[PDB]
């Protein structure tokens, strides 16, 4: 039980991966979406189409070690290629759970001293789940009024995922 990407390679500290659903039929990989009223796509969501792999995420922990295990506290951030205009000015797109709403959002304006990695990746059935440590709670999907598949803290109904190397 190492954390493995879909090829069977151990997840690398600082490696870049698509986060894809382990199960079929409910949507595709994780990406960004504009939700509610915001003019900028700040919510982490699951793509509605099964065909979409979404946006690669860089996953890393401050310890300067080569690989990741379920014991490490992770920063997760979206890779920044091909961004909409309102995000182009940022070089980093860190995931951060919004207290009260429990939505996973990116926080590109937050100052670095206020950003830390609170996620873990855990084995889940035959693949993986993401958890957020506030003890740890599963990340899952909550559907909003416009049918966006929001990634949110949802203890006990995790989104099953696997990690695919993002080549480029």
Residue numbers in the entry: 1 to 134, 141 to 174
Sentences copied from the publication:
The plant protease inhibitor EcTI from Enterobobium contortisiliquum is a classical trypsin inhibitor belonging to the Kunitz family. A Kunitz-type inhibitor that was first isolated from Enterolobium contortisiliquum was named EcTI. The fold of EcTI is a β-trefoil, typical for the STI-related family of Kunitz inhibitors. As found in most known Kunitz-type inhibitors, EcTI has a single reactive site located on loop L5, between β-strands 4 and 5.
The structure of free EcTI was refined to a higher resolution of 1.75 Å. The final model contains two inhibitor molecules, two imidazole molecules, two glycerol molecules, and 244 water molecules. Molecule A consists of residues 1–134 and 141–174, whereas molecule B contains residues 1–134 and 141–173. A loop region containing residues 23–26 of monomer B is in weak electron density, but is still included in the final model, whereas the density for the loop containing residues 111–113, not traced in the complex, is very clear. However, since the crystal structures of EcTI were obtained under mildly reducing buffer conditions, the disulfide bond Cys40-Cys86 was broken in molecule A of the free EcTI, as well as in the inhibitor molecule in the EcTI-trypsin complex. This observation indicates that the disulfide bond Cys133-Cys142 plays a more important role in stabilizing the β-trefoil fold, whereas the disulfide bond Cys40-Cys86 may not be as necessary for its stability. The equivalent residue in EcTI is also Asn13, which similarly forms a network consisting of several hydrogen bonds. Taking monomer B of free EcTI as a reference, only the Cα atoms of the P1, P2, and P1′ residues exhibit minor shifts, whereas the remaining residues of the reactive loop are in almost exactly the same conformation.
